[PDB]
Every structure is written in structure tokens, then in C-alpha cells.
Symmetry: D2
Subunit: 324 residues, 4 copies
């Protein structure tokens, strides 16, 4: 009587397929790979189905161009949209140039979620992340706690990796957060970086790392997306983005109460409301179950507010289109 | 001081990166992504490094364009090559058309394995699989038991998947083997298909599956690679090929004594010698530890011989190109 | 909101605690450890809770002496009862001697399952297995397909282990089944043993194993439980029994459609009905979804019938106790 | 040529067996279960071998009464000892009471490690922990960095569990350390407790947890071992101790560079030397690679010094017994 969890991946591109692969490997549930491109998602679904046999896991992987197949989905993860705006080089790529392109897609997707799986937990990945999640939320009519954006987990995992590498410790034992908008005004929280709860400052004071190296890592974290785009030559990152979204999905599916930075609907926290922005949150069976309001210093609070200001800017541009 | 296992991936494209992802997820050991394309492997290595942080695993992922970095690898997995021959068409995709382009790449890679990592266990993926592994082996100087080709695990995973699908059981509990050349004359062994050891014939007698349905599944298995190419539009399968090769690498790294079908150097088994072709084998810490010689019926033996003949015919082309 | 799966373990002894540990490690769901012994399950639940933190899993483990706490359990696994009959030596240890003691306990548990979690999938472990599961089913009023006994997965795992050990191959690649009653008259199906679908017979001919060795392995499988008892000195096996029951529980919870040998309610299969006996079955979200009827030879069929008669002998003793 | 890792467990009791189970589930390497009791480890090894087949893992489990079988071990984990001093009661259970019984055992074990596997990484569990590891180290001749005691990971996991429970978040996201002696004077470092790097102090201010609740948890953490002893009625904890020890073993075997609190040989850190005591350490392929010196406050430093003093006093008892 109790069926497997159902996870619909709206967008079967690099990140879409990669998330499906994680689902197959982890046996998270049945997977629906949706895309507007004909044949391709069916192709990937076949490949993934074969991969599940190798993994000795029990997972149906379905490729589709029909929104009807997302019916009854427990989780929906959205990557539909463009990665690199047309006519832009590698060394000038920006998430903000995509807004006119991707906003209309979020409406169509939101509308379809509304009628096929209105009780799904929905994770948005499409850029510009923080406004795309807002557009999705509006047109889907979903509860504020059942929709969020993936960015913070990815930005934070990068911050963690860079710190872990410099200190030569397991990234499991580094805690680091990046809050705010997903972009150049993201706010890596150096003051909150710990090694198993030990303040990063203790490693400074002990000369395991210098403040200047920390400053460089902060900058590298902010630019990490572009760094990868430049090195690859084609497209952008997808391994860590896929893993990031699936960590959020697992938190929901198994009611884990993970503390993860996600793009969450604010209802007054940090003195802001009516937008999604990167904040630490408790993720569980009820979606975004809690937004944690950090005791930011005035300096930190100003960086966050400037970050939120960027989102506000894009939001008007969205308003000057016609997507409620 | 016992270091982590070191796995070098020669070729950092679709399958290479995907394999590196599994290594990160599974914490198999440190990964070197080698490619001739500048910067791209470094870019992917960054993305994969970030994903390892998310996975809470402890894995070093290095992107490189220098064969020196493969020194002392425990396992080397080779994907270097073209996926589709230049100037060809989708429905006309053939593994054989890659022979003249990929043959010389196998010579180059072999020469470099010879000098930098002669003690590695080497898994070849590059198509056309069975002759590519021969070129690699010949030019690398490695022992016969330390080189093999990934094909049988993938072909068998497909055969298993389709059987499991039709019978509606877990693929874990379906045993199916495909032997011979990795191409149109591969031999799906219907007589050897079992469900937890229960012969497929019992399911036929009990009317759970028909001979006609089995026949369709046999042909579908043969055409699976091309089916995916036609659907994907760009490139060929990579999720299952990646998983297959890593299953083989795991068998070596942890001396598992897995029974896997791989392209192995024959020394009289099945009445054939001095070529690589798909056969059931025991894989462990000594590489291809044992080729299993199945009690084939005359009909099966003839199918196998015709399969081997295709490898011999491809070999004539290798010889005529002057690639040994 | 969707809650985590809930698994109630009725009996918190060795097997009970061990299953709880697997649950914590695998994050299968929240665990309730029930026992009539005061304080002990609370103590184990604390210990296990700490182990879940170490494992980075998200699992509540609750020890209890009250049946109310099994409310809403998705799976119930029952180990309540004695392991050894009082006034019996190890060399005379017999599962049959546990009957009058454990029969009455199965009645109580079934009554409590009826009122507290009538929709659970129930796995009985308590000996004498095949008749204990019938008692439990009778007094629980549960559907025939939602109750079964763990025995065949354990007996088969032993058969597999001993075969794999002799052939020196991965137990993953050995398929072996033991059907019939869980006792001296269990039936290890030598004819159905395969190595990745390859009949064991081929390895006899190829000289990797002899019929004499196989015969001795059959005997060792039958005696495996008593062999461990004699070696241990106190109680009986628990690591493999726990793992066997959890494998069954996982098949249900994730609707895997695994082919596992379990003690299942027969309704005409093999020419028998209205008793539980070990047979191959497909386990999924609807419990015992299908009982597979093997094409046993007359000789095999006679061994199985003899096995079934042993269950009937025990059953008649149950009738004596005046418990319907 | 490259063999599986080899892990020897000196002591095949509750914790020994449980650790072997984890090795089997995780496929960490082959396992030797050593004990002075005849037949018992052989019995457990069989049970565990069967469970490996169920897990589809590839692990040899060997029971023995001969030290010769621990030769070539990569890791050795020692649980040889009594759990409760004879003549004593549960409520008055004290690890210190075990000293005169287990000290001579550590000498015996140490002597045998000296001659059979001097190159192993050795983890001691036997109580009283901090002085038992010292006796073992003294009589084994091993390097200072290749020997340590399991305590801090367990104490910390308990601290973590209790904090995570109260705040209703995943224990993955709670960082908490307990340093010092493994006993009543252990030091749960409240100041260093974080939720993904967020200081616990913020949660106090935001009214998510009270100082009173924290004080209770600190006491509960100190008393946790005795709490379980009282509840179980027999023996002491084993699920979490086994897991803690395996976490340490994994960190070594795969060179993970984990930050874990372990009883480590001090050489001037914190102002102390030549004793083992619980401190944060980096564990990797070189064993105890680094002892981290925390910037303790003067109050915290006093607690730690008082904790170290307890070890010194236990050490006085060792010398008085005639065990150096
Ligand atoms: N069953 C099987 O055996 C399968 C085989 N394949 C084969 O695997 C190969 C790779 O497939 P994908 O990873 O999808 O292709 P891909 O095109 O994504 O990656 C191939 C990579 O090899 C690199 N390369 C080219 N020359 C090289 C050299 N001399 N040394 C090192 N690297 C070099 C390229 O720069 C490219 O990044 C193809 O030959 C394909 O036919 C693919 C799927 C299944
Ligand atoms: N946090 C910690 O450090 C913890 C420490 N412990 C300690 O771990 C030790 C073992 O606990 P359990 O496994 O539960 O006890 P157990 O009584 O179940 O097993 C102890 C085993 O050691 C064996 N043994 C005795 N003398 C020996 C010798 N000379 N050589 C080899 N083996 C010998 C016994 O035969 C017995 O099987 C105890 O000393 C206990 O106090 C237990 C829990 C947590
Ligand atoms: N931190 C982050 O949030 C993060 C990280 C990486 C990428 N991204 C973003 O995620 C998105 C996906 O990236 P990718 O690498 O998978 O790109 P991709 O080009 O590989 O995938 C996009 C897919 O969406 C499909 N698509 C386009 N319009 C659609 C519609 N109306 N309905 C359904 N599908 C449609 C395309 O056919 C394509 O397959 C991009 O917008 C990218 O900017 C975000
Ligand atoms: N193949 C198999 O099916 C298989 C394998 C191993 C053991 N077993 C059987 O499984 C059972 C459990 O074995 P074990 O090693 O866990 O024994 P154990 O003695 O360690 O555990 C039995 C537990 O059941 C409890 N109990 C007794 N009456 C109860 C009641 N009315 N309600 C709740 N709990 C009650 C006891 O207090 C004890 O904690 C035994 O009957 C044994 O014969 C079966």
C-alpha cells in the first residue's frame, strides 16, 4: 500500500541527469526525468535504469516530455532554463543575464506543479536562483515552507572544501556557511567557520592559517562558480550542484532536521519579508521547518542587507515582465 | 605510511567525470583526471572536490594534462577517444567507425602507462572495445591479467534490467550474462539467465514470460548502445558505463573475487587465443584471476565463434593501419 | 507531513538489539525496542541512540515495556521468546523444544499487533519458526500476505557462504536457496545453486568443487545453527539472523520486489495450504506478493513434502495446547 | 599483490563482535576475532561470515585463540578485559574498580602485539581507558602516535546526541567535544558546542535551550556510561563504543584526517606530558598525526588539569600493583 518515494526532475540537463544518478545510487525513490527536449530524457532514463541494475538498487527511472508524469511526486527539483546567456564569453558569464529567459519557464513549471503535485516539496535550482524560486512560488500556489532554492549548500560546501584543504582536515569536520543572495554578493561567514566547533580564529592565532589566506578563500568562494565555468570551457558546474540539491531532498524525504543554508521564504527574519534568500534553515518532513536568525554583527548584517538588496533589484525586473 | 588508493582516469570527459563522481561518493581513493584538453579536467576536479565535501568523503581529486601525475596508480581507467566518428550520422552510429581514430590514442596511452604506471590494473572503455584493449595491452607491455575491457558488465546489466523489468523483480536477483564482442554479435546467454538461480525456462513454462518476449529482449540488449545514442542526440551512454568500470575497479581494489564478464586476454579458452573478447572472469587483487569456460552448447559455441570472428575482422583493420 | 518509517522490534534481546543497530546504521526509520524485561530495552535504546549520532544518521530509538508504543508501526519484527530449552545440553539443542514456551508468547504479541498496528508487515523470528509464525498470524487477524517468518534468508545465506568459500568467489555472485521447514529437514536446493547463473554442476565438471564437498556443505548448512550454538556456549546466532530479517524488512519498506526465501502462508502452492513454510517469494510493498512454485523433481518434491510434514507434526502439538 | 586491509580484534566479547559486524557491513577489511575463550570466537566468526553474505560484502572473518593470526594487521582494537569488577554492585559501578584486573591483561596483550604486529595502529577500549592505554603502550613498544584510546568519540557522541535531542536537529549538525579523562571528571566543552558552527550561546539567547538544560546535559554526559550499566543489568555499553572505535579505525585506514577526540600520548600539549588523556586529534594514515591544543579559558583549563589529575591518581595505582 505504501509506494516508493517519487522524485520528479523538471529539467533533464547536466544537473538533472546527475541528480537522477544520485537517486539511483542511493535508492531514494523512483525518478521522473522531465524535459521539453524530445528523446533525450528517455535516453538518459534508459542509461540510468541500466546503472541501477549495476548498483543492485530498485528504482524506476522514467524519461518524459509530459508534465502529467509528475503526478504525486514527493519531491520536485527544477533545473529548467539556460546556463549561459547568448553571446557571452566564459569570462563574463553572469547569473543575472538569465532573468528574462528563465522567469517565464518558472511560471509554466509552477502552474504544472499546482495541478499535478501541489503537495510536493519543491527545490529550485534555476538561476538567478533567489528570484526564480520566488516566481516559482507565486505561480505554483504552494505553501511558503514547501518551496526553497538550492544555493547555500553549494556555496557552503565550497567554502568548507577550501578551508578543509588549507588546514588539511576532513571536510566532514569543517563547518562553514554562505548566506544571502546566490551571486557576487553572497556572504561567506568567516566568523562562523569552525573545525568540529573550534573557531577558525584559533587556527589563525596558532598560525595554521593566516587572515590573508582566509580573505582569499572568501573571495574564491564567491567566484567559485565562474572559476569552474572558465576552466571547463563548456557549460558550468553540475556535480556539486546536483549533490547539494539531493542533500536537501534527503533531509525532507527522511525528515532529518538537517541544518542547511537554503533560499527560504522570509516572513520577517533578518527584518525582511516576501522574498527568498539564503539563510540557515532546518529542513525536515514539513519542508523548511525553521529559519534560523543568526546573531549577525552590524558589519555582517550590512553585508546581508546589501545581498538582499540585489534580490530586490531583480524582483522589480521580474515585475516589469508580467508574471504576477 | 599507507596512502589511499590512487585511481587515474585517462580521459576526463563524460564517462571519466562520472567515474570520478562515483569514486568521490564511494570514497574509493584519490582520483586523477587526466585529459589532453587544457583546464577542463581541473575545472571538473574542482566541481568533484566540492561534491566530496557534500558527501562527507575524504578524496583528493586532481585535474591534469601531465601523464606524470598517474605515477603509482593502483587502477587506471581509460576513456580517451572519440564517441562518434567525424562526419557520421546518428542512426548510422557504429562503434567500428571509431577504430582508425581511437587506435592511435590507445597506442599513445599505452606507451605512457608503460613508463609511468606499469603496475596498475588497467580497465579500457574506449571503443571499439575489444580491439582497443588489445592495442592498449600491446603497447603498454602490461601482463595479460592486468588489462581488461569494460563491456560485459554493461551488456549484462542491460540484459538483466530488461529481464527484471518484464518479470517485475529486483535486478539484484536476476543473473544474466552477455559474452563475446561488444557489438552487434554480442551473445546474450538466454540459457544462463536465472532468477536467484531459478532457470528462466521455469518462468516460460509458468507463462510469466514468452519465448517471443525473450527474443525481443535479446535483440534489445544488442541494440541498447545505439538506442541510447539515437535518443541522446549527443554522445553515447555514460551513467552505466561509468558504474560498470567502477564495479570492476572495486573488485580489484578490495580483492572481491567478483564473477564479472569483461573483455579478457584469451589463452586457449573457448578454443581461441591472443585476442581480448568478452568472457566471464573472476576479478580480484591479481586482476583477471580466472577466465571461466562455460559449457556452451554447440549452438552457443557457434554464436560465440561468430562473435570472436568480428574481433578478428576488426583486428585486420588495426594491422592494416600499422598500429600493430 | 510524511513521517519516517517506524519499525517495532518485539523482543530486545540479542537479535532484537542487533536489528535495531542495523536500522540505526542504515537509517531505515525510527525504532521501538519492546521487551517484558524492565530497563534493559531503555538501556540498549540509549546506547543505540549514541551510535546513531556517531553514524551521522537521523533515527529515534525508543526502549519500552508497553505495547502502546508499537502504534502505527510500518514493520514489526518479533524475537520474543527463549533461545534454549531449560535442562537441555548444547549437543541436544533443538528448536522443537522451544514450542510450548514460545507458543503462548506469540498469542500475546498477535493480540497486541491486532489493536495497535493491524497494518504492519510482520516478520516472525521466534522459534520453532514455522509454527510460531502460524500462531502469530492466527491470533493477529492480519492478512496472509502481511505476515511471514524469517528462516530461509538465513539458511540460504549459510548455503551461499559455504559454497562461495569453497569456490573462492564473492558471495554476491552465488545464488543458493534452502526451502522447507527451518530445522534438520530444511532442503538445500543443490540443483538450483548458481554462480552468476552458471550451474554449480559446471564447476564440478571443471574440477573447482566435488560432489563430496557439495554433499558435506549441504549437511553443514542443515547443522549450521547447532554448530554455532556448540561453539558459542550461550544462546545462539544473532548477527546473520538480524541481518536476514532486516533484508526482508527493507524489501517491504522500499517495495524492492526481492526474491527471498521466507516462511510464507501457502494456499495451494506445492500442493499444500494453511501453514507457513519456507519457499521462494517476491517481497515488496504488499508484503509477500508472490510465492514462486519451483519445478522440483520428484526427489526434491519428496524432500520438501517430508519437510512440510515436520511442520504438520509441530502444528498438531499446537492443537493440544488448546490454542485454536 | 595488494591485500585487503586486516583488522584484528583482541577480545571477541560484546564490543569485539559488534565491531566485527561493522567491518562486515562496511567491507573495511578481513577480520580476526581473538579471545582466550576457546571456540567462542570461532562461533561468532561463522555467524559474522554468514552476515557478510547477506550484506553482499567480501570479508573473511576468522575466530582464533592464537596470536599468530594477528600478524600483519593494519589495525588492532583491544577490548580484552572485565566490564564489571567482581563483588561490586551496578549502582556503584566504577571504571576504576576494573584497574587491578585489566592492567595485567593490557600488559599481556601489549607483549604479544610487540612480537606479532608492531606496525599496526592500535586502539584500546578496555577500562579504565586512559591508564589502560598507557599500560598497553608501555609493554608494546609501539610508537607514541600509533597507539590511542577510544573514549572521546563516545563521550562526544553522547554530548552531541543530548544537545541535538534538545534542539531537535540532526546530530550530524551538532559539534560537541568532551576532553580529559574517561570518567566522572571528563570535560564536556560547553563553550565549543556548535550547530553547524553556530555557537550554542546563540540558541541560549534565542530561547531554544536553557543553561539549566545544558547543565543537566553536561551531567548526563558524564554519567551516561553508568546510566547504561544500570539499565542493562549486565555488561556495559557496546553499540556506540564499537562504532566509535570503528570510526577511529576508518580514519586511519583511509587516511581521512578526521578531527576526533581520543586518549592520546601527550608531549607537552596543555602543559602535560607522558600520559594518555582525551584531547582533540587529527587521525590519519600516520595514526595520531596531530594533537590540537584548544585555547581553553582559565576555568576550562582548570577543569582539564583536574581531569588529568584523575589519570595521575589512577597511574599511582598502576605503579603500586607492580605494572610499571
Ligand atoms: N561499453 C563501452 O565500452 C562504452 C564505451 N564508450 C567509449 O568511451 C569513450 C569515451 O566516451 P565519453 O567519455 O562519453 O567521451 P567524451 O568525448 O565525453 O570524452 C573523451 C575524452 O577523451 C579525451 N581525449 C582525446 N584524446 C586523448 C588522449 N590522447 N589522451 C587522453 N585523453 C584524450 C577527450 O579530450 C575527451 O575529453 C569513447 O571512445 C566511447 O566510444 C562509451 C560508452 C560505453
Ligand atoms: N568508553 C570506553 O572506553 C568503553 C570501554 N569498555 C570496556 O571495554 C572492555 C570490553 O567490554 P565488552 O566487550 O563489553 O566486554 P565482554 O566481557 O563482553 O568481552 C571482553 C572479552 O575479553 C576477553 N578477554 C579476557 N581476558 C583476555 C586476554 N588476556 N586476552 C584476550 N582476551 C581476553 C574475554 O574472554 C571477553 O570475551 C571492558 O574492559 C569495558 O570496561 C566498554 C564500553 C565502553
Ligand atoms: N547554485 C545554483 O543554484 C546552481 C548551480 C549550477 C547551475 N545552476 C542553474 O541550474 C540550471 C540548470 O543547469 P544545467 O547545467 O542542468 O543546464 P542544462 O542546459 O544542462 O539543463 C537545462 C535543461 O532545461 C531544459 N529546459 C529548457 N526549457 C525548459 C522548459 N520550459 N521546461 C522543461 N525543461 C526545459 C533544457 O532542455 C535543458 O535540458 C541553470 O539555469 C543554471 O544556471 C544553479
Ligand atoms: N532462523 C531463525 O528463525 C532464528 C535464528 C536465531 C534465533 N531464532 C529465535 O529467535 C528468538 C530470539 O533469539 P535471541 O537470540 O534474540 O534471544 P534473547 O534471549 O537474546 O532475546 C529474547 C528476548 O525476548 C524477550 N521476551 C520474552 N517474552 C517476551 C514477551 N512476552 N514480550 C516481549 N519480549 C519477550 C526476552 O526478555 C528477551 O529479551 C529465539 O526464540 C530463537 O530461538 C530464530
Amino acid at each position: 500500500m505504501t509506494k516508493r518515494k517519487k522524485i520528479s526532475l523538471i529539467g533533464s540537463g547536466m544537473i538533472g541527469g546527475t541528480m537522477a544518478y544520485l537517486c539511483a545510487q542511493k535508492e531514494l525513490g523512483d525518478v521522473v526525468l522531465f524535459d521539453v527536449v524530445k528523446n533525450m530524457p528517455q535516453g538518459k532514463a534508459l542509461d540510468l535504469s541500466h546503472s541501477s541494475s549495476i548498483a543492485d538498487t530498485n528504482v524506476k527511472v522514467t524519461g518524459t516530455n509530459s508534465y502529467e508524469d509528475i503526478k504525486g511526486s514527493d519531491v520536485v527539483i527544477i533545473t529548467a532554463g539556460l546556463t549561459k546567456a547568448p553571446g557571452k564569453s566564459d569570462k563574463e558569464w553572469s547569473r543575472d543575464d538569465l532573468l528574462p529567459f528563465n522567469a517565464k519557464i518558472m511560471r509554466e513549471v509552477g502552474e504544472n506543479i499546482k495541478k499535478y503535485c501541489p503537495n510536493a516539496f519543491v527545490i529550485v535550482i534555476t538561476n538567478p536562483l533567489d528570484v526564480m524560486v520566488k516566481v516559482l512560488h507565486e505561480h505554483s500556489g504552494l505553501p511558503k515552507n514547501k518551496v526553497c532554492g538550492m544555493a547555500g549548500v553549494l556555496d557552503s560546501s565550497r567554502f568548507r572544501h577550501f578551508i578543509a584543504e588549507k588546514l588539511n582536515v576532513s571536510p566532514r569536520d569543517v563547518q562553514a556557511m554562505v548566506i544571502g543572495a546566490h551571486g557576487d554578493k553572497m556572504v561567506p561567514l568567516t566568523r562562523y567557520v569552525t573545525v568540529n566547533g573550534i573557531p577558525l580564529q584559533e587556527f589563525i592565532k596558532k598560525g595554521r592559517i593566516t587572515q590573508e589566506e582566509i580573505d582569499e578563500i572568501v573571495e574564491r568562494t564567491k567566484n567559485a562558480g565562474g572559476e569552474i565555468v572558465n576552466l571547463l570551457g563548456q557549460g558550468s558546474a553540475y556535480f556539486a550542484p546536483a549533490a547539494s540539491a539531493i542533500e536537501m531532498a534527503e533531509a525532507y524525504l527522511k525528515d532529518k532536521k538537517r541544518v542547511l543554508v537554503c533560499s527560504c521564504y522570509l516572513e520577517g527574519q533578518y527584518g525582511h519579508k516576501d522574498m527568498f534568500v539564503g539563510v540557515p534553515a532546518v529542513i525536515g518532513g514539513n519542508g523548511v521547518e525553521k529559519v534560523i536568525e543568526l546573531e549577525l554583527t552590524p558589519e555582517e548584517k550590512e553585508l546581508f542587507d546589501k545581498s538582499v538588496e540585489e534580490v530586490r533589484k531583480l524582483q522589480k525586473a521580474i515585475k516589469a515582465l508580467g508574471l504576477e
